[PDB]
Amino acid sequence: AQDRNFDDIAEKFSRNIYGTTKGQLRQAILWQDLDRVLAEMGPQKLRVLDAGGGEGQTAIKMAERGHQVILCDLSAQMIDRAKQAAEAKGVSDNMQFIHCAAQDVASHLETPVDLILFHAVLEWVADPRSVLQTLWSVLRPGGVLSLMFYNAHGLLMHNMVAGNFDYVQAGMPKKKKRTLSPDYPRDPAQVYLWLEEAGWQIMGKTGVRVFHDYLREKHQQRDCYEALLELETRYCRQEPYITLGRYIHVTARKPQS
RNA sequence: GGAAGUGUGGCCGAGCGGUUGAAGGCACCGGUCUGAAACCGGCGACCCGAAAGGGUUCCAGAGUUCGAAUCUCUGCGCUUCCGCCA
Ligand SMILES: Nc1ncnc2c1ncn2[C@@H]1O[C@H](C[C@@H](N)CC[C@H](N)C(=O)O)[C@@H](O)[C@H]1O
Ligand SMILES: [Mg+2]
Ligand SMILES: [Mg+2]
Ligand SMILES: [Mg+2]
Ligand SMILES: [Mg+2]
Ligand SMILES: [Mg+2]
Ligand SMILES: [Mg+2]
Ligand SMILES: [Mg+2]
């Protein structure tokens, strides 16, 4: 079992996610957390690894804020897209692009990094425990891991809301190739264990899209976006709403001695 | 054993001498698609060939024909009737 290279769903992903409120809300919530992290990490500029950075929307926004950003990805097609978008934003000088697995990234870094982005990758890698161990090894003491993983509860809940009862009865097996539903939706409690057992200390948990995907009237996703975002922002950091997010964003600290 | 009748593709089902190795359907495989029907393409075996691809086979084979899934014959399997057995 290999990790999912996004080559043959690059366009679909960019269109269905970043071309809709799904991507817009993802980025909005995520950057609420990230800007808190950046400020709490002092005002110096940072070294940021975006492991599995894809088309680079998050990595470029980090670069616009002045940091040195290294993006690596399995997919040649995603790397090329990220290269173009970065040029067209004028941030290519602050950015490095590496066509390698996150597992193999350590040999491409001259020095450790301050902050790691691992966003919507964990649910696509066959051996999550192992990748997290590698990412730990390239993070300086006191560094932060920004981990956004796809939540199995959100897929159960939305399939229920949508009325796909037969599919849920059958355990929701992933048989559709080239869907954007991930190969390995994660149990959040298990992911929290993975981080704590491997020494990380969890500083925050945020639900990402905790109401949006379940709306009875999908058109309100766009027509009512500003009000929806305000209420997503209000509730997405308390239970049960954390555990209802389609994604969950965990902020975790590498300890210092 | 003897007639008649019968045998189409994985399963169904069109095919009363040619554009039918085979319509159409289900299944199976692949493709398209948010969030799990539809649409698109394919889809037996054996033989030949390095490959491209060619051949045979519509129970099996032989024949008639320019041409056979389609006509004739022989065999094989089945069905009914008879006869066998009692
Ligand atoms: N082991 C891996 N190492 C590096 N990149 C990976 C790996 N597995 C998957 N990917 C890439 O991870 C990306 C996952 C996508 N969900 C996009 C993530 C991107 N960070 C985003 O938030 O949009 C794809 O571009 C994949 O090609
Ligand atoms: Mg039949
Ligand atoms: Mg055929
Ligand atoms: Mg057919
Ligand atoms: Mg078809
Ligand atoms: Mg024949
Ligand atoms: Mg013919
Ligand atoms: Mg003949």
Residue numbers in the entry: 1 to 257
Q: What text does the study give?
A:
The wobble cmo5U in certain tRNAs are further methylated by SAM-dependent CmoM to produce its methyl ester, mcmo5U. CmoM is a member of Class I SAM-dependent methyltransferases (MTases), which adopts a Rossmann-fold with a β-sheet architecture of 3–2–1–4–5–7–6, where the 7th β-strand lies antiparallel to other β-strands. In Gram-negative bacteria, CmoB converts ho5U to cmo5U employing a unique metabolite carboxy-SAM (cxSAM) as the carboxymethyl donor, which is assembled from prephenate and SAM by CmoA. The tRNA-modifying activity and the specificity of E. coli CmoM was first reported by Suzuki and his colleagues, who identified that mcmo5U34 was present in tRNAAla1, tRNASer1, tRNAPro3 and tRNAThr4, whereas cmo5U34 was in tRNALeu3 and tRNAVal1 (17).
Here, we report an X-ray crystal structure of E. coli CmoM complexed with sinefungin, an analog of SAM, and cellularly expressed E. coli tRNASer1 containing cmo5U at the wobble position. The asymmetric unit of the X-ray crystal structure contains a tRNA molecule bound to a protomer of CmoM, mainly through the anticodon loop on the protein surface enriched with positive charges. The N-terminal helix (α1) swings towards the bound tRNA by approximately 30 Å to establish contact with phosphate groups of C32 and U33. Another notable change is observed in the organization of the loop encompassing residues 170–188, which is mostly disordered in the tRNA-free structure. In the tRNA-bound state, this loop mainly interacts with the phosphates of G30, U31, A36, and i6A37 through the formation of salt bridges. Meanwhile, the hypomodified base of cmo5U34, which has flipped out from the canonical stacking position, exhibits the most extensive interactions with the enzyme. A total of five residues are involved in multiple ionic/polar interactions with the modified uracil base, where the 5-carboxymethoxy group is thoroughly examined by R26, W124 and Y247. Therefore, these three residues appear to be primarily responsible for the proper positioning of the nucleophilic carboxyl group on cmo5U34, which is approximately 3 Å away from the Nϵ of sinefungin. The exocyclic amine group at C2 of guanine is one of the key structural features compared to adenine, which is specifically recognized by the amido sidechain of N164 and the backbone carbonyl group of A162. Surprisingly, the structural data was consistent with i6A at position 37 instead of the expected ms2i6A.
